[PDB]
From a paper:
CI is caused by linked pairs of Wolbachia genes called CI factors (CifA and CifB). Protein-binding experiments and expression of cif genes in yeast have shown that CifA binds its cognate CifB specifically and rescues CifB-induced yeast growth defects. CidBwMel consists of a region, which is predicted to contain two PD-(D/E)XK (pseudo) nuclease domains (residue 1-751; hereafter CidBwMelND1-ND2, ND: nuclease domain) and a C-terminal deubiquitylase ([name]) domain.
We determined the crystal structure of the CidBwMel [name] domain to 1.85 Å resolution. Similar to the structures of other proteases in the CE clan/Ulp1-like protease family, the [name] core consists of a five-stranded β sheet flanked by α helices on both sides. An active [name] domain is required for inducing a CI-like phenotype in transgenic D. melanogaster for cid operons. The crystal structure of CidBwMelDUB provides a solid structural basis for further investigation of the molecular targets and function of [name] deubiquitylase family proteins.
Residue numbers in the entry: 837 to 898, 903 to 914, 922 to 981, 984 to 1086, 1089 to 1121
The structure:
């Protein structure tokens, strides 16, 4: 069986059940289904990233001073992220927000993190890509259309992964740590300096924790990311994934589609 063979079989079942056919089998995959079958190389999609946000306490709660957005780049390639940064800058002017955390899909299944803080009239930004130091043009173009100065946006990336499949979780690990570094800098642990650059070394200390030669716990090895995947998957228990919407719309169809999805997972992500 091939991926297209599986897709044709799924689409026959969807047709019999008066549901919309799909164009890619990934449309019906989600982190919980993959993790329940021990496919830990599954790349997290946009719908999975909403559940991961709740695991890292981002969806809300960290009404409060922090803004949060899951967006993408690549209408113009920049409109969604630009719109989020604009809405944030308005809320800063309204006195409602101090900080924005954005988790950004840069197109080819790659997730990166951008955190912007406002402190007494200035906007400082910190960008992290788990692949290591390189910033993406659409990100830079979104920042330029929102008048965030390039001098005040800093690439704090550290080499953390090469496999690619865990960049979705690394994006949240890095957002947590950038936000902790900013929090501690506000309390005097470090100084921002004129352009916000002063905290970059402290950020990189947290981003490098538990990888390579660093012995700090948790060691963020493959087993660590398997357990994070298991923990994120527990939050799925429905309507927020395309799979969950199909199941709720056609209860019991999972008995016909899940065997084929498992075959696809074995092929795409062995």
């Amino acid at each position: 069986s091939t991926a297209q063979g599986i897709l044709q079989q799924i689409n026959t079942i969807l047709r019999r059940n008066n549901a919309r056919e799909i164009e890619d089998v990934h449309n019906l995959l989600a982190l919980d289904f993959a993790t329940e079958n021990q496919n830990f190389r599954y790349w997290l999609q946009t719908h999975d990233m909403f559940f991961a946000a709740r695991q890292y306490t981002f969806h809300d709660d960290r009404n409060d001073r922090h803004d949060f957005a899951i967006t993408s780049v690549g209408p113009t390639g920049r409109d969604l992220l630009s719109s989020n940064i604009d809405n944030f800058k308005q809320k800063v002017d309204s006195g409602e927000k101090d900080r924005l955390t954005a988790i950004i899909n840069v197109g080819n299944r790659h997730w990166v993190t951008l955190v912007i803080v406002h402190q007494n009239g200035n906007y400082y930004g910190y960008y992290a890509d788990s692949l290591g130091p390189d910033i993406d043009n659409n990100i830079r173009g979104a920042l330029r259309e929102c008048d965030i100065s390039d001098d005040n946006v800093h690439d704090v990336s550290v080499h953390q992964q090469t496999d690619g499949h865990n960049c979705g979780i690394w994006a949240y690990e890095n957002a947590r740590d950038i936000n902790q570094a900013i929090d501690q800098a506000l309390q005097g642990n470090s100084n921002f300096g004129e352009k916000g650059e002063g905290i970059i070394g402290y950020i990189r200390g947290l981003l490098s924790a538990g990888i390579g030669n660093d012995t700090r716990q948790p060691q963020r090895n493959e087993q660590y990311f398997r357990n994070r995947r298991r923990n994120i998957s527990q939050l799925f228990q429905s309507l927020s994934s395309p799979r969950g919407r199909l199941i709720q719309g056609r209860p019991g169809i999972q008995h016909e589609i899940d065997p084929l999805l498992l075959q696809f997972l074995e092929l795409q992500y062995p």
